[PDB]
Each structure stands twice: as C-alpha cells, then as structure tokens.
Write a protein that binds this ligand. Structure first.
Ligand SMILES: [Mg+2]
Lengths: 100, 412, 50
C-alpha cells in the first residue's frame, strides 16, 4: 500500500488459484500473469530513485500442479534457471524449445 | 422398394466428433496435397505457411505436460461447442455389398446400370438420411472402384456434406472422411465445370470455417489441416467467405483468444496467393483492416498479436506486387500501431516488427533508428529479433558499419 | 473409495482421469477455485452422494 511499481508475476492458473483465497485477495491489483513460453521484459525500477533495470523472463511448464511453471531469467549477469518443484521424465529435457 | 426394407430409417445414428486422430489421418491429407500440387499442377513449390501454421506429427512438450499443470486450463476462448463410430460399417449387408461391388468391378466412361441406380438413390436429397449415409460409406469403402467414374460421384458427396441436415453436428468423422475421399479424387475430377459443384464447394467451405474451432488442440489442428488442404486443392473454384473471417478475428476483447482462429484462417487464405479482401461483402476496407490491425494491441497471448503481425506483413507483401492503392493506408496503420507501444512496452514492439519485416522488409526503414536504440537494452531472444530486423535491411542502408561499431557489435 | 491426498494441488490429474474413465465425479471440499477452468470443474462435485 506504499508502492506502485512492485508486482507479483506468476502463471495465470496460479493467479486464479491465489485470488480465490480471501486472505490473498489484496494482491488483486498487483499480480501480473505471464503466458508460458513467451519471453517478456520485466522492468526492475527502483521505488526511491528513478533507476531502472530490464530483465527477460520466460515461463516454462513444470508438470507438478495447476499453475506450476519454471523461471528462466536473462540479463547482464548471464542466464539463470529456477525449476521450483518440477517433474520431468528421462529424455524430456531435450524437448524444451526455450532451453535450446 | 428394396433398400428401405433392409434399413432402419428410424435410428438416430450418433456421429461423434473424432477426438483421437490417428497417424494415417495426417499422412492421407499430406499425400492428397502432394498429388494435387504436382500431379495436377506440376510446380513442386509448396506454399510457405506462417509460423502459427507450422505442424508437427506429435505434440509439443508443453502439450504433454499440460495434463499435470494445466497451462491451457484457464478458459480464454468464448465459442460455444460440444469403436462406436463405424456403426454403418457394422451393418448386416455392409460387407456383403462391398464384396459384391469389388467382385463385379473386376468381373468419359458412363455409369453402368447399377452405378446409375446408386447415383439415383444417393444424389436425391429426398431419400432418407440413413440410406444416403449407407451409400456414402459403401462408396468410401470401395473408392478404388469408383475412381474411374468419380466425375459423376463428386456432386452427391458434395451436396451430402454441404447439407445442413447431416448425420451429426459439427465436423464429424463422416464429413472428414468424405472430404478426404473427394480430395483424393481431385486428381482426375474437380468441381470447376458445373456451377452447382461450385456452390456446393462454397457452402462446404463455409460450413468448415463455421465449425472449425474445438477446445481440444489436436482436433482443432486437424480441422485447420483439412480446411488448408481443401483450399489448396480447390484453389481455382472457391470464393473465400471474408465476412465470416472478419467476424472471427474481430472480437475486441483484450483477454480472449477468439481472434486467433480468424487470424489463422486469414493466414491459410493468404498462403495460397489469394486476395486478402473482396469488396463484395458488407464490410468496407477501412474497418476490416482496422480491426485486423487492432489485434496487435492485444499483447497478452502471442498467438493473437504475433500472428496478426505476421499475417498483416504477408498482406503488405501481397499488395506490394499487385500495386494496390491501399498499401499506403495499411502501412500507416501498422506504423501507428507499432509506434504506439514502441515506447510503452518496447518488448512486444520488437516482436511485432520482426513478424512484419519477416515478409515485408521495406517497413523497417522507419524503425531502424528505434531498433538501433533498443539493441543495447535487449537480452535473450529479443536481441536476436532486433539483429534479425537489422539484417532484413542491410543493402538498403547507406553506411551501416558505424552504427554497429557504436553498438558494440564485436562483443555481441 | 477415499483418496487421502495430502497436498492441496497436484492430484487433479488423477481426479480428472478417474472421472473420465469411470463417469463418477470426485467429491472435494471447495471447487470454486476452478470456476474458470472448465476441464477440471466438470469433474468435481460438492455433493456427498458420489
Ligand atoms: Mg511442489
């Protein structure tokens, strides 16, 4: 309630599952859902100072639960990957288009 | 009468929409296009469809993993939609009739007496639906013995498919089967001579594009495939229903994917070197192309704005060679829609520009400075798209090496 | 048949496939969370007579 440029990015299914709970309905105006396999640019603008920083994030399916996705960041410090609670069978890592 | 006795005439023959498409169901249309493209045209240069129309035999990894995380679970569309299939093949006299026909065949050619009887019973729209369906299944199972006479059997199957009162609702397996049979028959006979066949084919195409959508991705791709091969075979006989497509890609809803169907239909139309618009419809050129270009403002789903940008670029490339007088207005609208989000989001702008300049290079000459400004600020695939936009216009640039040196091209 | 599922989400695959292969609808406490997901909502029910 004291900021305007900070948001919560997640899958659309995750947004639907999160806004249903009454305890988390205060995030209704601060959640930005992102489609999977769609490279989008995120602005890491500072609140106090007018400094800004752009980063590219890509959401990859995880196959864990409704709304579970991965996070593939690409910026100045190289490419990092966050596979939070994923599930992949053997021989499926070679089938992800966005990781190639 | 002899046929109405051995048929029920009262059983509601359930025809469900085929969901689990087999592997041969794709290669049959593949070979149909292979025959209708070279055996009857002799060109061997298949139409280059857009990225959204690129097809694979199996499904992508996201489709397979969607069974667990439901990535496509959120309802985005708004269209209203709904072996126990071959019950006609499980008829008492079905196999005996097929054996009889196969035996008697081998036991400008005109139809014999039995073929005349079959044609009189099938082509007549007053004959009950069950008898016509049985005759259609018999012709399907014995298409090899009907090919030398397929010039006569083209109209009955056409008017059976184009009929509003068919077996089931939607595009069921009987429709796709008879369509595949007719398109395999297109190598020798085409609905081009008799205007009745032309209007039958037009109504069939309208019916296909009317019920092309289906929430299941596989059957939706199959319907797009059958429409694609149908418009590829009968390219010189069909009038495209531009009014239906306009209503398809004009939804004006930022959080929906309804326009994707219309954009893909327009791309299928444009890939066969067809006009993107005909003034015969009630929609003028202004609002038509306006609603078409407005899809680039829907920056939520890529299948909407990226596909719209690509199909718009194809339309620009088409109207470029034909020297039409709407090229200036279309280019102005596209440049306006691009500059609208050039500075707001600047990440969908580069994607839309790369999709447009993929087929219409001369549009990047006004955004070259913008993409050179945005190049140092991009990462990942966005920088690659910007470099591709720079690549599409290299010979036209006066002096390029200084800009690349100033933009640290070597470390890139 | 009871299904002692500890996690809140992750077992919807089992529920949907059992419903599609048996025609019966699984009973859950809350299902309003899947109101915008038709492929999952039409497999769950609040009635206890299943
Ligand atoms: Mg987990």
């Amino acid at each position: 309630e004291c900021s305007l440029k900070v948001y919560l990015y997640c899958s659309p299914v995750t947004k639907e599952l999160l806004l249903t709970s009454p305890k988390y309905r205060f995030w209704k105006k601060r959640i930005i859902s992102i489609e999977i396999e769609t490279p989008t640019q995120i602005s890491l603008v500072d609140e106090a100072s007018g400094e800004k920083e752009e980063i590219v994030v890509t959401l990859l399916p995880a196959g864990h639960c409704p709304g579970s996705v991965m996070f593939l960041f690409q910026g100045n410090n190289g490419t990092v990957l966050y596979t939070g609670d994923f599930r992949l069978a053997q021989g499926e890592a070679a089938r992800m288009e966005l990781l190639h | 009468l002899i046929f109405e006795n051995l048929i029920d005439l009262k059983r509601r023959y359930n025809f469900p929409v085929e969901v689990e498409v087999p592997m041969e169901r794709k290669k049959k249309y593949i070979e149909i296009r292979k025959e209708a493209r070279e055996a009857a045209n002799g060109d061997s240069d298949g139409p280059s469809y857009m990225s959204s129309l690129s097809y694979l035999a199996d499904s992508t990894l996201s489709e397979e993993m969607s069974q667990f995380d439901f990535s496509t679970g959120v309802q985005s569309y708004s269209y209203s939609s709904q072996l126990e299939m071959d019950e006609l093949n499980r008829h008492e006299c079905m196999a005996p009739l097929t054996a009889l026909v196969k035996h008697m065949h081998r036991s400008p050619r005109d139809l014999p007496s039995w073929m005349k009887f079959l044609h009189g019973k099938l082509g007549n729209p007053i004959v009950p639906l069950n008898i016509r369906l049985f005759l259609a299944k018999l012709v399907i199972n014995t298409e090899e013995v009907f090919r030398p006479y397929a010039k006569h059997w083209l109209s009955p199957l056409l008017q059976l498919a184009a009929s509003e009162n068919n077996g089931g609702e939607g595009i069921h397996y009987m429709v796709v089967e008879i369509v595949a049979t007719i398109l395999s028959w297109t190598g020798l006979a085409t609905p081009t001579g008799v205007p009745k066949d032309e209007v039958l084919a037009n109504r069939l195409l309208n019916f296909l594009m009317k019920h092309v959508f289906h929430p299941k991705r596989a059957v939706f791709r199959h319907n797009l495939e059958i429409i694609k091969t149908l418009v590829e075979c009968w390219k010189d006989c069909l009038s495209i229903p531009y009014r239906l497509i306009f209503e398809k890609f004009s939804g004006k809803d930022p959080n929906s994917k309804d326009n994707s169907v219309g954009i893909q239909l327009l791309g299928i139309v444009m890939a066969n070197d067809l006009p993107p618009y005909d003034p015969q419809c009630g929609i003028q050129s202004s609002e038509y192309f306006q609603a078409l270009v407005n899809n680039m403002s829907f920056v939520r789903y890529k299948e909407v704005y990226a596909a719209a940008a690509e199909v718009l670029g194809l339309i620009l490339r088409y109207v470029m060679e034909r020297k039409n007088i709407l090229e200036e207005s279309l280019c102005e609208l596209v440049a306006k829609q691009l500059k609208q989000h050039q500075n707001t989001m600047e990440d969908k702008f580069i994607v839309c520009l790369n999709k447009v300049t993929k087929s219409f290079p001369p549009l990047a000459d006004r955004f070259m400075n913008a993409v050179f400004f945005l190049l140092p600020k991009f990462h990942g695939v966005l920088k690659t798209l910007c470099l591709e936009v720079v690549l599409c216009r290299v010979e036209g640039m006066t002096e390029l090496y200084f800009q690349l040196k100033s933009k640290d091209f070597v470390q890139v | 048949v009871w299904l002692n599922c500890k996690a809140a989400y992750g077992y919807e695959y089992l529920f949907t496939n059992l419903s599609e292969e048996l025609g019966v609808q699984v009973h859950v406490n809350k299902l309003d969370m899947f109101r915008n997901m038709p492929e999952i909502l039409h497999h769950l029910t609040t009635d206890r007579n299943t």
